[PDB]
């Protein structure tokens, strides 16, 4: 335990933005994104997160990754995977215009499967590609789709072969990682998995920590500051 | 009792499992098409794909034509998922020719990533019920459907009277749990079988292998046992 606490004063800030008012009010703005009162509300109660929250959060992990001791990180926008599974390399090879995906330690790939979120992660240090689902599901397919994409990107941006030597692809089973009870927490699980993983910290929390993680993320998002 | 697959039936079942012509059309009904590859999804370590579940749900729909049995409407498997992600807007063109309220029961297969659950509106028992088989919670679904009925105005220019209708993700005890995830679709399909007949959910994980064999047979013959 010893999760950073949310002081009373922090709580007032949180309560305030869960209130009603200008639903368009830009609560925070960064990385080409825009979190409004409306997006922020998707964190309330037991509401489903929306893509804006997820992408904004993933970008904070990415910004945090700029410090040392820590593994450098690129985070793909959430639309990336689905525009890859359903339309292939061609539709998304553009998005990495100006990005050397091979120059970082870790890639985050939020995976939107219907109403559900999961996450895949390319860690180059370990030389492996891993899939995380807070519901137990496994999805070697998605890891192979990322290998293919990786393969095809090496050629394209690098004119070189992608070396799969030692490279392992796989899913983590329900006992390896805390599981959800509320379907709506799936997005929180994905964001929180990436938080530990990008700090190279063990995934320590469980489902009971979710009400608090939602409250905290509102806060973090609003200050563009991770605790 | 469970209804027996005789060796004669088991022999028909053995036949559809072979290498080659995976795109071969084996059964075909309710504008759906079930191929060898679809049918393989009923083998022991496999997850039922959507075409299987949609076909079975449509068989429960036809069965429901039988007198004495409650009238039943089953939504396709992409339905609930689109009602959520894209809102009522993207699903009301789906019942253009169906009058929902003219039936005892609505079946809504919920696909949640890889998992399958099931929601039931019994119009003649006034409530929605949600059966997950993996001990799971999703209470929204249950209101989104009360929401959905109210919104399906779009059909007969009347608000829908929603007096004391209830929403609950059904307990583990209360219903047989899986042991194998791969069987989640069967659980939804078979919860569903039980409900549409009115008889209680009287089976366990132990019966799942049999239930797969039997469903291959049921789908090949468009005949429920």
Swiss-Prot record, chain A:
Residues 33-196 are annotated as: Protease. Changing residue 24 to A: No effect on SUMO2 processing and SUMO2 deconjugating activities. It is found in: Nucleus; Cytoplasm. A motif (Nuclear localization signal) lies at residues 157-160, 211-217. Changing residue 48 to A: Impairs SUMO2 processing and SUMO2 deconjugating activities. The active site is at 116, 133, 186 (nucleophile). Changing residue 117 to A: Abolishes SUMO2 processing and SUMO2 deconjugating activities. Disulfide bonds: none annotated. Highly expressed in testis. Expressed at lower levels in thymus, pancreas, spleen, liver, ovary and small intestine. Belongs to the peptidase C48 family. Protease that catalyzes two essential functions in the SUMO pathway. The first is the hydrolysis of an alpha-linked peptide bond at the C-terminal end of the small ubiquitin-like modifier (SUMO) propeptides, SUMO1, SUMO2 and SUMO3 leading to the mature form of the proteins. The second is the deconjugation of SUMO1, SUMO2 and SUMO3 from targeted proteins, by cleaving an epsilon-linked peptide bond between the C-terminal glycine of the mature SUMO and the lysine epsilon-amino group of the target protein. Deconjugates SUMO1 from HIPK2. Interacts with RBM33; promoting ALKBH5 desumoylation and subsequent activation. This is Sentrin-specific protease 1. It comes from Homo sapiens. The lineage of its organism: Eukaryota, Metazoa, Chordata, Craniata, Vertebrata. The gene is SENP1.
